[PDB]
Amino acid sequence: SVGLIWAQSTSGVIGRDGGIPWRLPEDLAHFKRLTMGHTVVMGRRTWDSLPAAHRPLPGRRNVVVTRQTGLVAHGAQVVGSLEQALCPAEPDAATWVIGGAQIYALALPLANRCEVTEVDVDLPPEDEDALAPVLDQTWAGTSGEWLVSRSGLRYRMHSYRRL
Ligand SMILES: NC(=O)c1ccc[n+]([C@@H]2O[C@H](COP(=O)([O-])OP(=O)(O)OC[C@H]3O[C@@H](n4cnc5c(N)ncnc54)[C@H](OP(=O)(O)O)[C@@H]3O)[C@@H](O)[C@H]2O)c1
Ligand SMILES: CCc1nc(N)nc(N)c1OCCCOc1ncccc1N1CCC(C(F)(F)F)CC1
Ligand SMILES: [Cl-]
């Protein structure tokens, strides 16, 4: 059972300049709660983007997807494909794919749940941005209310399940 979890601007941006181009503490808390104790699968660029204090993510089984043979990711398990990441030698009840755009596209056919934070931030996409997946008609969801962050941004959470 594989879920994707991401935060996106309403315009669909998830990443810029090797990071996330807004600050949304309530999203960090949401992400922390959903993933603690579970497996988190990420692309190598997302692994390299992590803040020092969260590389690896504490209290979670970190898995990093790369084409590099012999890459070492201290504190994580390195695998060579998303399929390998979803075939662990030690099964986990809950596996979360935590980005980025390349790994989400590989993961979406294998997933049955998406947890999406939508951020009302004016971010006209730029040419090198990482963009969110778009969920087609095989997905249906439920939306929480629009809330205001202590940071000032409006945001809301969506939960999708494969039909
Ligand atoms: N807003 C959010 O929720 C969120 C979440 C996560 C990340 N982000 C942002 O998104 C950006 C990073 O995303 P990204 O799309 O650029 O990168 P990414 O998906 O995190 O990682 C890409 C890397 O994954 C590996 N990879 C990709 N396809 C593969 C395949 N078929 N087999 C094996 N390895 C494969 C490659 O690593 P190698 O080059 O090592 O071979 C590739 O360079 C950053 O800006 C980050 O801050 C945002
Ligand atoms: C939070 C950002 C986030 N939101 C949702 N809803 N889905 C995600 N897939 C996601 O991206 C997680 C991987 C990238 O993560 C970060 N990128 C930049 C800055 C900070 C982080 N975080 C902070 C929390 C930290 C902790 F370990 F505490 F969880 C992990 C690193
Ligand atoms: Cl944490």
JSON list of C-alpha atoms and ligand atoms in Angstrom, two decimals:
[
{"chain": "A", "resi": 1, "resn": "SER", "atom": "CA", "xyz": [0.00, 0.00, 0.00]},
{"chain": "A", "resi": 2, "resn": "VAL", "atom": "CA", "xyz": [1.74, 3.07, -1.40]},
{"chain": "A", "resi": 3, "resn": "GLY", "atom": "CA", "xyz": [0.77, 6.70, -0.86]},
{"chain": "A", "resi": 4, "resn": "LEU", "atom": "CA", "xyz": [2.12, 9.92, -2.30]},
{"chain": "A", "resi": 5, "resn": "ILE", "atom": "CA", "xyz": [2.32, 13.05, -0.19]},
{"chain": "A", "resi": 6, "resn": "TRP", "atom": "CA", "xyz": [3.21, 16.50, -1.50]},
{"chain": "A", "resi": 7, "resn": "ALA", "atom": "CA", "xyz": [2.54, 20.20, -1.07]},
{"chain": "A", "resi": 8, "resn": "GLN", "atom": "CA", "xyz": [1.90, 22.38, -4.11]},
{"chain": "A", "resi": 9, "resn": "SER", "atom": "CA", "xyz": [1.04, 25.94, -4.91]},
{"chain": "A", "resi": 10, "resn": "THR", "atom": "CA", "xyz": [-2.37, 26.33, -6.55]},
{"chain": "A", "resi": 11, "resn": "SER", "atom": "CA", "xyz": [-0.39, 26.90, -9.76]},
{"chain": "A", "resi": 12, "resn": "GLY", "atom": "CA", "xyz": [1.10, 23.40, -9.42]},
{"chain": "A", "resi": 13, "resn": "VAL", "atom": "CA", "xyz": [4.66, 24.22, -8.31]},
{"chain": "A", "resi": 14, "resn": "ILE", "atom": "CA", "xyz": [6.33, 21.91, -5.79]},
{"chain": "A", "resi": 15, "resn": "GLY", "atom": "CA", "xyz": [10.01, 22.82, -6.16]},
{"chain": "A", "resi": 16, "resn": "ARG", "atom": "CA", "xyz": [12.29, 25.66, -7.26]},
{"chain": "A", "resi": 17, "resn": "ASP", "atom": "CA", "xyz": [16.04, 26.29, -6.92]},
{"chain": "A", "resi": 18, "resn": "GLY", "atom": "CA", "xyz": [16.54, 22.97, -5.12]},
{"chain": "A", "resi": 19, "resn": "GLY", "atom": "CA", "xyz": [13.99, 23.70, -2.42]},
{"chain": "A", "resi": 20, "resn": "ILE", "atom": "CA", "xyz": [10.33, 24.48, -1.67]},
{"chain": "A", "resi": 21, "resn": "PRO", "atom": "CA", "xyz": [9.49, 28.13, -2.48]},
{"chain": "A", "resi": 22, "resn": "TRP", "atom": "CA", "xyz": [7.24, 28.95, 0.49]},
{"chain": "A", "resi": 23, "resn": "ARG", "atom": "CA", "xyz": [7.20, 28.45, 4.25]},
{"chain": "A", "resi": 24, "resn": "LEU", "atom": "CA", "xyz": [4.15, 26.66, 5.63]},
{"chain": "A", "resi": 25, "resn": "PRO", "atom": "CA", "xyz": [4.64, 25.32, 9.17]},
{"chain": "A", "resi": 26, "resn": "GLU", "atom": "CA", "xyz": [1.24, 23.63, 9.29]},
{"chain": "A", "resi": 27, "resn": "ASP", "atom": "CA", "xyz": [2.23, 21.59, 6.22]},
{"chain": "A", "resi": 28, "resn": "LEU", "atom": "CA", "xyz": [5.47, 20.50, 7.86]},
{"chain": "A", "resi": 29, "resn": "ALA", "atom": "CA", "xyz": [3.49, 19.34, 10.90]},
{"chain": "A", "resi": 30, "resn": "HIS", "atom": "CA", "xyz": [0.94, 17.53, 8.70]},
{"chain": "A", "resi": 31, "resn": "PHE", "atom": "CA", "xyz": [3.75, 15.77, 6.82]},
{"chain": "A", "resi": 32, "resn": "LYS", "atom": "CA", "xyz": [5.57, 14.89, 10.07]},
{"chain": "A", "resi": 33, "resn": "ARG", "atom": "CA", "xyz": [2.45, 13.34, 11.62]},
{"chain": "A", "resi": 34, "resn": "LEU", "atom": "CA", "xyz": [1.47, 11.29, 8.58]},
{"chain": "A", "resi": 35, "resn": "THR", "atom": "CA", "xyz": [4.93, 9.84, 8.02]},
{"chain": "A", "resi": 36, "resn": "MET", "atom": "CA", "xyz": [6.49, 9.26, 11.47]},
{"chain": "A", "resi": 37, "resn": "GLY", "atom": "CA", "xyz": [7.33, 5.61, 12.00]},
{"chain": "A", "resi": 38, "resn": "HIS", "atom": "CA", "xyz": [6.85, 4.71, 8.34]},
{"chain": "A", "resi": 39, "resn": "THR", "atom": "CA", "xyz": [8.95, 4.20, 5.22]},
{"chain": "A", "resi": 40, "resn": "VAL", "atom": "CA", "xyz": [9.63, 7.35, 3.18]},
{"chain": "A", "resi": 41, "resn": "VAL", "atom": "CA", "xyz": [10.81, 6.94, -0.43]},
{"chain": "A", "resi": 42, "resn": "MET", "atom": "CA", "xyz": [12.40, 9.86, -2.26]},
{"chain": "A", "resi": 43, "resn": "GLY", "atom": "CA", "xyz": [14.37, 10.71, -5.34]},
{"chain": "A", "resi": 44, "resn": "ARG", "atom": "CA", "xyz": [18.05, 11.49, -5.00]},
{"chain": "A", "resi": 45, "resn": "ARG", "atom": "CA", "xyz": [17.51, 15.19, -5.69]},
{"chain": "A", "resi": 46, "resn": "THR", "atom": "CA", "xyz": [14.97, 15.40, -2.86]},
{"chain": "A", "resi": 47, "resn": "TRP", "atom": "CA", "xyz": [17.44, 13.60, -0.57]},
{"chain": "A", "resi": 48, "resn": "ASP", "atom": "CA", "xyz": [20.03, 16.25, -1.44]},
{"chain": "A", "resi": 49, "resn": "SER", "atom": "CA", "xyz": [17.47, 19.01, -0.80]},
{"chain": "A", "resi": 50, "resn": "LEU", "atom": "CA", "xyz": [16.76, 18.01, 2.81]},
{"chain": "A", "resi": 51, "resn": "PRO", "atom": "CA", "xyz": [17.69, 20.40, 5.62]},
{"chain": "A", "resi": 52, "resn": "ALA", "atom": "CA", "xyz": [20.72, 19.15, 7.53]},
{"chain": "A", "resi": 53, "resn": "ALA", "atom": "CA", "xyz": [18.70, 18.41, 10.65]},
{"chain": "A", "resi": 54, "resn": "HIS", "atom": "CA", "xyz": [16.37, 16.13, 8.64]},
{"chain": "A", "resi": 55, "resn": "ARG", "atom": "CA", "xyz": [18.89, 14.26, 6.46]},
{"chain": "A", "resi": 56, "resn": "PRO", "atom": "CA", "xyz": [17.94, 11.48, 7.16]},
{"chain": "A", "resi": 57, "resn": "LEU", "atom": "CA", "xyz": [14.37, 12.02, 8.31]},
{"chain": "A", "resi": 58, "resn": "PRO", "atom": "CA", "xyz": [14.34, 10.87, 11.96]},
{"chain": "A", "resi": 59, "resn": "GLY", "atom": "CA", "xyz": [12.18, 8.01, 13.09]},
{"chain": "A", "resi": 60, "resn": "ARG", "atom": "CA", "xyz": [11.38, 6.92, 9.54]},
{"chain": "A", "resi": 61, "resn": "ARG", "atom": "CA", "xyz": [12.89, 4.33, 7.20]},
{"chain": "A", "resi": 62, "resn": "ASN", "atom": "CA", "xyz": [14.55, 6.50, 4.54]},
{"chain": "A", "resi": 63, "resn": "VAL", "atom": "CA", "xyz": [14.85, 5.08, 1.01]},
{"chain": "A", "resi": 64, "resn": "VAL", "atom": "CA", "xyz": [16.63, 6.99, -1.79]},
{"chain": "A", "resi": 65, "resn": "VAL", "atom": "CA", "xyz": [16.16, 6.23, -5.50]},
{"chain": "A", "resi": 66, "resn": "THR", "atom": "CA", "xyz": [19.14, 6.83, -7.81]},
{"chain": "A", "resi": 67, "resn": "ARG", "atom": "CA", "xyz": [20.71, 5.52, -11.00]},
{"chain": "A", "resi": 68, "resn": "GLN", "atom": "CA", "xyz": [24.14, 5.97, -9.43]},
{"chain": "A", "resi": 69, "resn": "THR", "atom": "CA", "xyz": [25.77, 2.69, -8.58]},
{"chain": "A", "resi": 70, "resn": "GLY", "atom": "CA", "xyz": [27.61, 2.79, -5.29]},
{"chain": "A", "resi": 71, "resn": "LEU", "atom": "CA", "xyz": [26.03, 6.04, -4.09]},
{"chain": "A", "resi": 72, "resn": "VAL", "atom": "CA", "xyz": [26.11, 6.24, -0.29]},
{"chain": "A", "resi": 73, "resn": "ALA", "atom": "CA", "xyz": [23.25, 8.05, 1.46]},
{"chain": "A", "resi": 74, "resn": "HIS", "atom": "CA", "xyz": [24.27, 8.00, 5.14]},
{"chain": "A", "resi": 75, "resn": "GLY", "atom": "CA", "xyz": [21.18, 7.21, 7.19]},
{"chain": "A", "resi": 76, "resn": "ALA", "atom": "CA", "xyz": [19.19, 5.93, 4.19]},
{"chain": "A", "resi": 77, "resn": "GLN", "atom": "CA", "xyz": [18.90, 2.83, 2.05]},
{"chain": "A", "resi": 78, "resn": "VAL", "atom": "CA", "xyz": [19.86, 3.38, -1.59]},
{"chain": "A", "resi": 79, "resn": "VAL", "atom": "CA", "xyz": [17.89, 1.57, -4.32]},
{"chain": "A", "resi": 80, "resn": "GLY", "atom": "CA", "xyz": [18.06, 1.67, -8.12]},
{"chain": "A", "resi": 81, "resn": "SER", "atom": "CA", "xyz": [14.39, 1.96, -9.08]},
{"chain": "A", "resi": 82, "resn": "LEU", "atom": "CA", "xyz": [11.07, 2.88, -7.56]},
{"chain": "A", "resi": 83, "resn": "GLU", "atom": "CA", "xyz": [9.98, -0.77, -7.87]},
{"chain": "A", "resi": 84, "resn": "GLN", "atom": "CA", "xyz": [12.97, -1.78, -5.74]},
{"chain": "A", "resi": 85, "resn": "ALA", "atom": "CA", "xyz": [11.89, 0.86, -3.20]},
{"chain": "A", "resi": 86, "resn": "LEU", "atom": "CA", "xyz": [8.44, -0.77, -3.03]},
{"chain": "A", "resi": 87, "resn": "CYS", "atom": "CA", "xyz": [9.91, -4.29, -2.62]},
{"chain": "A", "resi": 88, "resn": "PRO", "atom": "CA", "xyz": [11.76, -3.99, 0.70]},
{"chain": "A", "resi": 89, "resn": "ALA", "atom": "CA", "xyz": [13.32, -7.05, 2.26]},
{"chain": "A", "resi": 90, "resn": "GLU", "atom": "CA", "xyz": [11.53, -6.03, 5.48]},
{"chain": "A", "resi": 91, "resn": "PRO", "atom": "CA", "xyz": [7.89, -5.17, 4.65]},
{"chain": "A", "resi": 92, "resn": "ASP", "atom": "CA", "xyz": [6.34, -1.99, 6.03]},
{"chain": "A", "resi": 93, "resn": "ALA", "atom": "CA", "xyz": [2.61, -1.51, 6.54]},
{"chain": "A", "resi": 94, "resn": "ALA", "atom": "CA", "xyz": [2.82, 2.09, 5.30]},
{"chain": "A", "resi": 95, "resn": "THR", "atom": "CA", "xyz": [5.07, 3.44, 2.54]},
{"chain": "A", "resi": 96, "resn": "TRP", "atom": "CA", "xyz": [4.99, 7.13, 1.62]},
{"chain": "A", "resi": 97, "resn": "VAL", "atom": "CA", "xyz": [6.56, 8.54, -1.53]},
{"chain": "A", "resi": 98, "resn": "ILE", "atom": "CA", "xyz": [7.73, 12.01, -0.49]},
{"chain": "A", "resi": 99, "resn": "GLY", "atom": "CA", "xyz": [9.04, 13.43, -3.81]},
{"chain": "A", "resi": 100, "resn": "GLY", "atom": "CA", "xyz": [10.18, 14.88, -5.99]},
{"chain": "A", "resi": 101, "resn": "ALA", "atom": "CA", "xyz": [8.45, 15.41, -9.34]},
{"chain": "A", "resi": 102, "resn": "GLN", "atom": "CA", "xyz": [10.39, 12.67, -11.13]},
{"chain": "A", "resi": 103, "resn": "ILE", "atom": "CA", "xyz": [9.75, 10.07, -8.43]},
{"chain": "A", "resi": 104, "resn": "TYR", "atom": "CA", "xyz": [6.06, 11.04, -8.10]},
{"chain": "A", "resi": 105, "resn": "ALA", "atom": "CA", "xyz": [5.52, 10.29, -11.79]},
{"chain": "A", "resi": 106, "resn": "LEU", "atom": "CA", "xyz": [7.15, 6.86, -11.40]},
{"chain": "A", "resi": 107, "resn": "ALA", "atom": "CA", "xyz": [5.14, 6.15, -8.24]},
{"chain": "A", "resi": 108, "resn": "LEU", "atom": "CA", "xyz": [1.65, 7.31, -9.22]},
{"chain": "A", "resi": 109, "resn": "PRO", "atom": "CA", "xyz": [0.70, 4.12, -11.18]},
{"chain": "A", "resi": 110, "resn": "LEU", "atom": "CA", "xyz": [1.61, 2.04, -8.12]},
{"chain": "A", "resi": 111, "resn": "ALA", "atom": "CA", "xyz": [-0.16, 4.19, -5.54]},
{"chain": "A", "resi": 112, "resn": "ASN", "atom": "CA", "xyz": [-3.66, 4.10, -4.12]},
{"chain": "A", "resi": 113, "resn": "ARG", "atom": "CA", "xyz": [-3.60, 7.25, -1.95]},
{"chain": "A", "resi": 114, "resn": "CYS", "atom": "CA", "xyz": [-2.43, 10.84, -2.37]},
{"chain": "A", "resi": 115, "resn": "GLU", "atom": "CA", "xyz": [-2.24, 13.39, 0.47]},
{"chain": "A", "resi": 116, "resn": "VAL", "atom": "CA", "xyz": [-1.95, 16.88, -1.03]},
{"chain": "A", "resi": 117, "resn": "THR", "atom": "CA", "xyz": [-1.49, 20.25, 0.63]},
{"chain": "A", "resi": 118, "resn": "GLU", "atom": "CA", "xyz": [-2.66, 23.13, -1.56]},
{"chain": "A", "resi": 119, "resn": "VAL", "atom": "CA", "xyz": [-0.97, 26.48, -0.87]},
{"chain": "A", "resi": 120, "resn": "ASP", "atom": "CA", "xyz": [-2.51, 29.77, -2.02]},
{"chain": "A", "resi": 121, "resn": "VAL", "atom": "CA", "xyz": [0.77, 31.45, -2.89]},
{"chain": "A", "resi": 122, "resn": "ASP", "atom": "CA", "xyz": [1.24, 33.47, -6.05]},
{"chain": "A", "resi": 123, "resn": "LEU", "atom": "CA", "xyz": [3.97, 31.52, -7.83]},
{"chain": "A", "resi": 124, "resn": "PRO", "atom": "CA", "xyz": [3.95, 31.95, -11.58]},
{"chain": "A", "resi": 125, "resn": "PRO", "atom": "CA", "xyz": [5.84, 28.82, -12.61]},
{"chain": "A", "resi": 126, "resn": "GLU", "atom": "CA", "xyz": [9.37, 29.32, -13.91]},
{"chain": "A", "resi": 127, "resn": "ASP", "atom": "CA", "xyz": [11.10, 27.21, -16.53]},
{"chain": "A", "resi": 128, "resn": "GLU", "atom": "CA", "xyz": [13.08, 24.90, -14.21]},
{"chain": "A", "resi": 129, "resn": "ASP", "atom": "CA", "xyz": [10.37, 24.37, -11.57]},
{"chain": "A", "resi": 130, "resn": "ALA", "atom": "CA", "xyz": [9.41, 20.96, -10.29]},
{"chain": "A", "resi": 131, "resn": "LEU", "atom": "CA", "xyz": [5.66, 20.55, -10.83]},
{"chain": "A", "resi": 132, "resn": "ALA", "atom": "CA", "xyz": [3.08, 18.40, -9.06]},
{"chain": "A", "resi": 133, "resn": "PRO", "atom": "CA", "xyz": [1.43, 15.36, -10.65]},
{"chain": "A", "resi": 134, "resn": "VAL", "atom": "CA", "xyz": [-2.09, 15.95, -11.94]},
{"chain": "A", "resi": 135, "resn": "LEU", "atom": "CA", "xyz": [-4.59, 13.34, -10.82]},
{"chain": "A", "resi": 136, "resn": "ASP", "atom": "CA", "xyz": [-6.94, 12.05, -13.52]},
{"chain": "A", "resi": 137, "resn": "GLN", "atom": "CA", "xyz": [-10.46, 10.60, -13.31]},
{"chain": "A", "resi": 138, "resn": "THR", "atom": "CA", "xyz": [-9.24, 7.36, -11.72]},
{"chain": "A", "resi": 139, "resn": "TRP", "atom": "CA", "xyz": [-8.76, 9.38, -8.49]},
{"chain": "A", "resi": 140, "resn": "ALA", "atom": "CA", "xyz": [-11.37, 10.91, -6.21]},
{"chain": "A", "resi": 141, "resn": "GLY", "atom": "CA", "xyz": [-10.86, 12.97, -3.12]},
{"chain": "A", "resi": 142, "resn": "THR", "atom": "CA", "xyz": [-12.10, 14.99, -0.19]},
{"chain": "A", "resi": 143, "resn": "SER", "atom": "CA", "xyz": [-11.05, 18.53, 0.70]},
{"chain": "A", "resi": 144, "resn": "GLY", "atom": "CA", "xyz": [-10.54, 20.12, 4.09]},
{"chain": "A", "resi": 145, "resn": "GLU", "atom": "CA", "xyz": [-11.51, 23.71, 4.72]},
{"chain": "A", "resi": 146, "resn": "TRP", "atom": "CA", "xyz": [-9.29, 26.59, 3.70]},
{"chain": "A", "resi": 147, "resn": "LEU", "atom": "CA", "xyz": [-7.23, 27.60, 6.74]},
{"chain": "A", "resi": 148, "resn": "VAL", "atom": "CA", "xyz": [-4.81, 30.47, 7.35]},
{"chain": "A", "resi": 149, "resn": "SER", "atom": "CA", "xyz": [-1.28, 29.64, 8.41]},
{"chain": "A", "resi": 150, "resn": "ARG", "atom": "CA", "xyz": [0.35, 31.40, 11.34]},
{"chain": "A", "resi": 151, "resn": "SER", "atom": "CA", "xyz": [2.77, 32.42, 8.51]},
{"chain": "A", "resi": 152, "resn": "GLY", "atom": "CA", "xyz": [-0.06, 34.15, 6.63]},
{"chain": "A", "resi": 153, "resn": "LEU", "atom": "CA", "xyz": [-0.63, 31.75, 3.72]},
{"chain": "A", "resi": 154, "resn": "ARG", "atom": "CA", "xyz": [-4.02, 30.23, 3.00]},
{"chain": "A", "resi": 155, "resn": "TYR", "atom": "CA", "xyz": [-3.80, 26.46, 2.63]},
{"chain": "A", "resi": 156, "resn": "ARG", "atom": "CA", "xyz": [-5.93, 23.34, 2.68]},
{"chain": "A", "resi": 157, "resn": "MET", "atom": "CA", "xyz": [-5.43, 19.58, 2.66]},
{"chain": "A", "resi": 158, "resn": "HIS", "atom": "CA", "xyz": [-6.88, 17.14, 0.12]},
{"chain": "A", "resi": 159, "resn": "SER", "atom": "CA", "xyz": [-7.02, 13.36, 0.53]},
{"chain": "A", "resi": 160, "resn": "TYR", "atom": "CA", "xyz": [-7.37, 11.23, -2.61]},
{"chain": "A", "resi": 161, "resn": "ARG", "atom": "CA", "xyz": [-7.96, 7.51, -3.09]},
{"chain": "A", "resi": 162, "resn": "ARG", "atom": "CA", "xyz": [-7.88, 5.50, -6.30]},
{"chain": "A", "resi": 163, "resn": "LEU", "atom": "CA", "xyz": [-11.38, 4.67, -7.52]},
{"chain": "B", "resi": 1, "resn": "LIG", "atom": "N1", "xyz": [6.63, 20.49, -2.25]},
{"chain": "B", "resi": 1, "resn": "LIG", "atom": "C1", "xyz": [6.83, 19.19, -1.99]},
{"chain": "B", "resi": 1, "resn": "LIG", "atom": "O1", "xyz": [5.96, 18.46, -1.50]},
{"chain": "B", "resi": 1, "resn": "LIG", "atom": "C2", "xyz": [8.15, 18.60, -2.39]},
{"chain": "B", "resi": 1, "resn": "LIG", "atom": "C3", "xyz": [8.50, 17.31, -2.00]},
{"chain": "B", "resi": 1, "resn": "LIG", "atom": "C4", "xyz": [9.74, 16.79, -2.35]},
{"chain": "B", "resi": 1, "resn": "LIG", "atom": "C5", "xyz": [10.61, 17.56, -3.09]},
{"chain": "B", "resi": 1, "resn": "LIG", "atom": "N2", "xyz": [10.25, 18.80, -3.47]},
{"chain": "B", "resi": 1, "resn": "LIG", "atom": "C6", "xyz": [11.12, 19.64, -4.37]},
{"chain": "B", "resi": 1, "resn": "LIG", "atom": "O2", "xyz": [11.20, 19.00, -5.63]},
{"chain": "B", "resi": 1, "resn": "LIG", "atom": "C7", "xyz": [12.53, 19.18, -6.18]},
{"chain": "B", "resi": 1, "resn": "LIG", "atom": "C8", "xyz": [13.19, 17.84, -6.39]},
{"chain": "B", "resi": 1, "resn": "LIG", "atom": "O3", "xyz": [12.40, 17.08, -7.34]},
{"chain": "B", "resi": 1, "resn": "LIG", "atom": "P1", "xyz": [12.99, 16.55, -8.70]},
{"chain": "B", "resi": 1, "resn": "LIG", "atom": "O4", "xyz": [11.86, 16.06, -9.52]},
{"chain": "B", "resi": 1, "resn": "LIG", "atom": "O5", "xyz": [13.93, 17.55, -9.28]},
{"chain": "B", "resi": 1, "resn": "LIG", "atom": "O6", "xyz": [13.89, 15.31, -8.24]},
{"chain": "B", "resi": 1, "resn": "LIG", "atom": "P2", "xyz": [13.60, 13.93, -7.48]},
{"chain": "B", "resi": 1, "resn": "LIG", "atom": "O7", "xyz": [12.41, 13.25, -8.09]},
{"chain": "B", "resi": 1, "resn": "LIG", "atom": "O8", "xyz": [13.58, 14.12, -6.02]},
{"chain": "B", "resi": 1, "resn": "LIG", "atom": "O9", "xyz": [14.97, 13.09, -7.79]},
{"chain": "B", "resi": 1, "resn": "LIG", "atom": "C9", "xyz": [15.38, 12.88, -9.15]},
{"chain": "B", "resi": 1, "resn": "LIG", "atom": "C10", "xyz": [16.47, 11.84, -9.13]},
{"chain": "B", "resi": 1, "resn": "LIG", "atom": "O10", "xyz": [15.89, 10.56, -8.83]},
{"chain": "B", "resi": 1, "resn": "LIG", "atom": "C11", "xyz": [16.60, 9.56, -9.54]},
{"chain": "B", "resi": 1, "resn": "LIG", "atom": "N3", "xyz": [15.71, 8.89, -10.47]},
{"chain": "B", "resi": 1, "resn": "LIG", "atom": "C12", "xyz": [14.74, 9.43, -11.27]},
{"chain": "B", "resi": 1, "resn": "LIG", "atom": "N4", "xyz": [14.15, 8.56, -12.06]},
{"chain": "B", "resi": 1, "resn": "LIG", "atom": "C13", "xyz": [14.79, 7.37, -11.76]},
{"chain": "B", "resi": 1, "resn": "LIG", "atom": "C14", "xyz": [14.65, 6.06, -12.27]},
{"chain": "B", "resi": 1, "resn": "LIG", "atom": "N5", "xyz": [13.75, 5.72, -13.21]},
{"chain": "B", "resi": 1, "resn": "LIG", "atom": "N6", "xyz": [15.45, 5.10, -11.76]},
{"chain": "B", "resi": 1, "resn": "LIG", "atom": "C15", "xyz": [16.33, 5.43, -10.81]},
{"chain": "B", "resi": 1, "resn": "LIG", "atom": "N7", "xyz": [16.56, 6.63, -10.26]},
{"chain": "B", "resi": 1, "resn": "LIG", "atom": "C16", "xyz": [15.75, 7.55, -10.78]},
{"chain": "B", "resi": 1, "resn": "LIG", "atom": "C17", "xyz": [17.76, 10.27, -10.23]},
{"chain": "B", "resi": 1, "resn": "LIG", "atom": "O11", "xyz": [18.86, 10.31, -9.30]},
{"chain": "B", "resi": 1, "resn": "LIG", "atom": "P3", "xyz": [20.39, 10.33, -9.81]},
{"chain": "B", "resi": 1, "resn": "LIG", "atom": "O12", "xyz": [20.56, 11.64, -10.53]},
{"chain": "B", "resi": 1, "resn": "LIG", "atom": "O13", "xyz": [21.18, 10.24, -8.53]},
{"chain": "B", "resi": 1, "resn": "LIG", "atom": "O14", "xyz": [20.55, 9.13, -10.70]},
{"chain": "B", "resi": 1, "resn": "LIG", "atom": "C18", "xyz": [17.17, 11.66, -10.47]},
{"chain": "B", "resi": 1, "resn": "LIG", "atom": "O15", "xyz": [18.16, 12.68, -10.68]},
{"chain": "B", "resi": 1, "resn": "LIG", "atom": "C19", "xyz": [13.26, 20.10, -5.20]},
{"chain": "B", "resi": 1, "resn": "LIG", "atom": "O16", "xyz": [13.04, 21.46, -5.55]},
{"chain": "B", "resi": 1, "resn": "LIG", "atom": "C20", "xyz": [12.56, 19.77, -3.88]},
{"chain": "B", "resi": 1, "resn": "LIG", "atom": "O17", "xyz": [12.73, 20.82, -2.93]},
{"chain": "B", "resi": 1, "resn": "LIG", "atom": "C21", "xyz": [9.06, 19.34, -3.12]},
{"chain": "B", "resi": 2, "resn": "LIG", "atom": "C1", "xyz": [7.62, 19.37, 4.43]},
{"chain": "B", "resi": 2, "resn": "LIG", "atom": "C2", "xyz": [7.52, 19.49, 2.89]},
{"chain": "B", "resi": 2, "resn": "LIG", "atom": "C3", "xyz": [6.58, 18.43, 2.36]},
{"chain": "B", "resi": 2, "resn": "LIG", "atom": "N1", "xyz": [5.27, 18.56, 2.60]},
{"chain": "B", "resi": 2, "resn": "LIG", "atom": "C4", "xyz": [4.43, 17.63, 2.15]},
{"chain": "B", "resi": 2, "resn": "LIG", "atom": "N2", "xyz": [3.11, 17.78, 2.42]},
{"chain": "B", "resi": 2, "resn": "LIG", "atom": "N3", "xyz": [4.77, 16.56, 1.43]},
{"chain": "B", "resi": 2, "resn": "LIG", "atom": "C5", "xyz": [6.06, 16.43, 1.17]},
{"chain": "B", "resi": 2, "resn": "LIG", "atom": "N4", "xyz": [6.46, 15.35, 0.45]},
{"chain": "B", "resi": 2, "resn": "LIG", "atom": "C6", "xyz": [7.02, 17.36, 1.64]},
{"chain": "B", "resi": 2, "resn": "LIG", "atom": "O1", "xyz": [8.35, 17.16, 1.30]},
{"chain": "B", "resi": 2, "resn": "LIG", "atom": "C7", "xyz": [9.10, 16.28, 2.20]},
{"chain": "B", "resi": 2, "resn": "LIG", "atom": "C8", "xyz": [10.48, 16.17, 1.52]},
{"chain": "B", "resi": 2, "resn": "LIG", "atom": "C9", "xyz": [11.16, 17.54, 1.47]},
{"chain": "B", "resi": 2, "resn": "LIG", "atom": "O2", "xyz": [11.28, 18.02, 2.83]},
{"chain": "B", "resi": 2, "resn": "LIG", "atom": "C10", "xyz": [11.64, 19.32, 3.06]},
{"chain": "B", "resi": 2, "resn": "LIG", "atom": "N5", "xyz": [11.98, 20.07, 2.06]},
{"chain": "B", "resi": 2, "resn": "LIG", "atom": "C11", "xyz": [12.30, 21.36, 2.27]},
{"chain": "B", "resi": 2, "resn": "LIG", "atom": "C12", "xyz": [12.32, 21.89, 3.54]},
{"chain": "B", "resi": 2, "resn": "LIG", "atom": "C13", "xyz": [11.96, 21.08, 4.62]},
{"chain": "B", "resi": 2, "resn": "LIG", "atom": "C14", "xyz": [11.59, 19.76, 4.41]},
{"chain": "B", "resi": 2, "resn": "LIG", "atom": "N6", "xyz": [11.24, 18.87, 5.44]},
{"chain": "B", "resi": 2, "resn": "LIG", "atom": "C15", "xyz": [10.86, 19.47, 6.72]},
{"chain": "B", "resi": 2, "resn": "LIG", "atom": "C16", "xyz": [10.26, 18.41, 7.66]},
{"chain": "B", "resi": 2, "resn": "LIG", "atom": "C17", "xyz": [11.25, 17.23, 7.85]},
{"chain": "B", "resi": 2, "resn": "LIG", "atom": "C18", "xyz": [10.71, 16.18, 8.77]},
{"chain": "B", "resi": 2, "resn": "LIG", "atom": "F1", "xyz": [11.56, 15.14, 8.92]},
{"chain": "B", "resi": 2, "resn": "LIG", "atom": "F2", "xyz": [10.47, 16.70, 9.99]},
{"chain": "B", "resi": 2, "resn": "LIG", "atom": "F3", "xyz": [9.54, 15.67, 8.34]},
{"chain": "B", "resi": 2, "resn": "LIG", "atom": "C19", "xyz": [11.52, 16.60, 6.48]},
{"chain": "B", "resi": 2, "resn": "LIG", "atom": "C20", "xyz": [12.14, 17.71, 5.62]},
{"chain": "B", "resi": 3, "resn": "CL", "atom": "CL", "xyz": [9.69, 14.59, 12.96]}
]
